[PDB]
Amino acid sequence: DLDLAKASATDQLKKAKAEAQVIIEQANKRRSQILDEAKAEAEQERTKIVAQ
């Protein structure tokens, strides 16, 4: 019992760390989506004022 409690308990944190990595990776990828959307729309904005 003590060995299995140690094992199953300690594996939890090894597991959760990878999900902290999941969250940071998702964070940066959606961040890239933010920036790469705003850049293209600002491009079209400048082009609109230019045509005007």
């Binding site: 400048r46 082009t47 004022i49 230019v50």
Partner: protein
Amino acid sequence: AQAEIEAERKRAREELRKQVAILAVAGAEKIIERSVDEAANSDIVDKLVAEL
């Protein structure tokens, strides 16, 4: 884009100046060749030989 509009204004102003500029002399040539006479010729030649 505030600079790329200004570059276009400067450039259009320049092209307009260019066209008016060439028309000025292209017209002046026709005016001269249409409005000369030997009195006008003599005046010029005699002015310029006097500084020869």
